[PDB]
Paper text:
Mitochondrial proteins CHCHD10 and CHCHD2 are mutated in rare cases of heritable FTD, ALS and PD and aggregate in tissues affected by these diseases. Here, we demonstrate that the low complexity N-terminal domains of both D10 and D2, as well as the full-length proteins, can form amyloid fibrils in vitro and in vivo. Structures of D10 and D2 fibrils assembled in vitro from the low complexity N-terminal domains of each protein show that their core comprises the most highly conserved region between the two proteins. For D10 and D2, the central conserved VAV motif forms a beta-strand that is associated with the protofilament interface in all the structures we have observed, suggesting that it may be a critical element in fibril formation and may be expected to appear in ex vivo structures as well.
We also determined the structure of D2-NT amyloid fibrils to 2.03 Å resolution, which again contains two identical PFs related by a helical symmetry axis. The core ordered region of each D2-NT PF consists of D2 residues G54–G86. A sequence alignment of D10 and D2 shows that this region corresponds to residues G43–G75 of D10 and features only 5 sequence differences between the two proteins. Therefore, the core ordered regions of D2-NT and D10-NT fibrils are formed by highly homologous regions within each protein. The D2 PF fold contains three strands consisting of residues L55–T61, V66–V68, and S70–T81. Strand-1 adopts a very similar conformation to that observed in the D10-NT PF1 structure, as do the last five residues of strand-3, and the two strands pack together in a nearly identical manner in both structures, with residue F73(D10)/F84(D2) packing against the equivalent Q47(D10)/Q58(D2) residue. However, in the D2-NT structure, strand-1 of one PF (PF-A) packs against strand-3 of the other PF (PF-B), because the beta-helix that connects the two strands in the D10-NT structure reverses on itself, allowing the C-terminal region of D2-NT PF-A to occupy the location of the C-terminal region of PF-B in the D10-NT structure. In addition to this, strand-2 of the D2-NT is superposable on the corresponding VAV sequence of all three D10-NT PFs and forms the central part of the PF interface both in the D2-NT structure and in D10-NT polymorph-1.
Author numbering:
A (entry chain G), B (entry chain E), C (entry chain F), D (entry chain B), E (entry chain A), F (entry chain C): 54 to 86
The structure:
Amino acid sequence: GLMAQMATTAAGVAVGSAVGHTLGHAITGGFSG
Amino acid sequence: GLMAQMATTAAGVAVGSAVGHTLGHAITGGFSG
Amino acid sequence: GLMAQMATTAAGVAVGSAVGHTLGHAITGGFSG
Amino acid sequence: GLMAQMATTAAGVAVGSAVGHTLGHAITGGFSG
Amino acid sequence: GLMAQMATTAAGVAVGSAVGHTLGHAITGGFSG
Amino acid sequence: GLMAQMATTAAGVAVGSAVGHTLGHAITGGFSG
């Protein structure tokens, strides 16, 4: 599926393998004034 | 599925393998003034 | 499923393997003034 | 410094604000066979 | 410094604000056979 | 400094604001057979 070999010295965010998914109905609110 | 081999020295956030998912109905509120 | 081999020296947050999911109906409140 | 306002429904890993740092001497071992 | 306003429904990894830094001497091992 | 307003429905990795830096001496190992 997902494979990662990572060598990092400094990182704000370090991620090897990651999945995000929505099935069905998903609603994300936006930005309003 | 998900495999990660990570070598890191400094990280704000370090994650090997991660999954986030919604099934069915998901509503996220936004930002309003 | 999820496998992680991580070597880290300093991390704000270090996570090997993690899953978060919602099934059915999920509502997250947003930010309002 | 670091400020975060996050609305999330499902996440493997959810982090608002995070710092990781090394001062001086830091050695991270790698992967060998 | 760092500011984030994030609305997300599904994420493998969700991070608002993050810093990773090394000061001085940092050595990260690599991958060898 | 860094500001982010992000609306996302599905993401493998979602990051608002992030900084990674090395000061001084940093060595990252590579990949060898």
